[PDB]
Write a protein that binds this ligand. Structure first.
Ligand SMILES: OC[C@H]1CC[C@H](O)CC1
Ligand SMILES: OC[C@H]1CC[C@H](O)CC1
Ligand SMILES: [Mg+2]
Ligand SMILES: [Mg+2]
Lengths: 253, 253
């Protein structure tokens, strides 16, 4: 029984942990960044997956607290090893409208960047497709302010939900992440491949970088690489893993 | 002011009228079809525009009645002149998920087509961006059934709302209508033109046709024509007009 009070208690007890999935250069296979995903480790019941708590976190507003804690915990995890990270190491944080609009959001982003090195790392706010940022002047002001501070944006799960051409028109973002439904169907159906080409063409004029999500097989990767995708992410390389294991597997060694 | 009961009463009092906007071949300027739009003429106070009633029509469910009436009235309006219509004359009807999934929908579409000539006209169900059809087997069955009956589909206001690549992947539609926000901004801003190019490239592989909406100036039209758009629609040619005036201006002369 997942309730707002159970989520609040779990936040106090720091049960929401940052699992980290590596991301790679499509050209060379080299580690270029990561995405931070949340896992609720309930001390008795075990893993409660995002599907069961994120929606309620969002409607209750608790998501703001959760995201703040994940950002803070990500800084703590990576700080001891920040000198071992490649240059321009990307850190992907999933951001909903509620977090984006919350007083003090910009400050939390700066704290993460300052702790880890203003110029060593690149913070990528991965804007969700489900609870899009509204298209308003105020939203654009926050967006522009963060950009002036060298923080960057992705449209996440592009091609699904509210992740439309309109968002690219309203917000000059830096990355587009292709939803896995297109990546994984591009070798199977008649349009999914064409959709990936379309996203590649879309990115080219403004000079955005593309990441293919959900890369599961080598043929999917080769296909994505061949179509001009810049970064790759998925279970072929690694699923998301706990922080200590992310450090141990992908940073050390 | 505007309530579900006022909408119900207005339906019974026939205050919702089908206005009709012509659509044209971009290459030649020739009449190829129309879109059926709704206007609420309140007897004392005047027009209540779609923006103020459609949402409440949709959430209340009354949209199903309204759309049914509009389809029926469009048949009545065009029947006397159907022999004067060009071959393959397109009739665009705006359809939300609620209408599409309602009992009796397919039947209403057939009645329209049979009254007007199975092979003279082409019914185009313009799927809305606000209230997308769910991506389910049952939805796809209704979609396929209608296709077998030579009824066609458009993704309306493509690039906005939920009108994403995913809808093209889930439903093999026949047309894409480009939202006016791209048509009218193409050559004011830095990406809108690029977005139209992208929609043109998107359509080409599966062989879909494109209509540019909101064509307001000659330079917008020339631009859309140059980029390979197939059909044009907007105030430059004509706003929507009452049926009798549609017939008198665009059919019977
Ligand atoms: O390392 C490439 C990065 C691109 C942006 C993404 O949001 C994170 C991974
Ligand atoms: O006349 C071309 C037609 C294209 C489909 C649209 O939904 C109606 C107009
Ligand atoms: Mg993400
Ligand atoms: Mg329409």
């Amino acid at each position: 029984i997942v309730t707002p009070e159970a989520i609040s208690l779990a936040l106090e007890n720091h049960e929401f942990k940052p699992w980290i999935q590596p991301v790679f250069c499509a050209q060379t296979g080299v580690l270029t960044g990561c995405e931070v995903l949340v896992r609720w480790e309930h001390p008795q019941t075990g893993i409660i997956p995002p599907d069961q708590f994120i929606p309620l976190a969002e409607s209750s507003g608790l998501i703001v607290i959760m995201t703040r804690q994940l950002m803070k915990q990500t800084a703590d995890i990576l700080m001891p090893v920040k000198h071992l990270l490649p240059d321009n190491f990307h850190i992907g944080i999933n951001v909903s409208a509620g977090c984006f609009l919350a007083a003090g959001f910009e400050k939390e982003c700066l704290n993460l960047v300052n702790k880890l090195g203003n110029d060593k790392i690149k913070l990528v706010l991965e804007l969700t497709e489900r609870n899009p940022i509204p298209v308003t002047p105020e939203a654009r002001a926050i967006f522009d302010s963060l950009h002036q501070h060298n923080i960057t944006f992705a449209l996440d799960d592009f091609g699904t939900g509210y992740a439309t051409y309109r968002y690219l028109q309203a917000f000059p973002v830096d990355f587009i992440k292709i939803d896995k439904s297109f990546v994984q169907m591009a070798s199977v159906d008649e349009i999914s491949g064409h959709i990936v080409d379309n996203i590649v063409e879309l990115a080219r004029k403004p000079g955005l970088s593309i990441v293919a999500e959900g890369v599961e097989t080598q043929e999917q990767a080769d296909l994505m690489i061949g179509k001009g995708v810049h970064f790759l992410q998925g279970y072929l390389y690694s699923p998301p893993v706990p922080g200590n294991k992310f450090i141990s597997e992908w940073v050390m060694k």
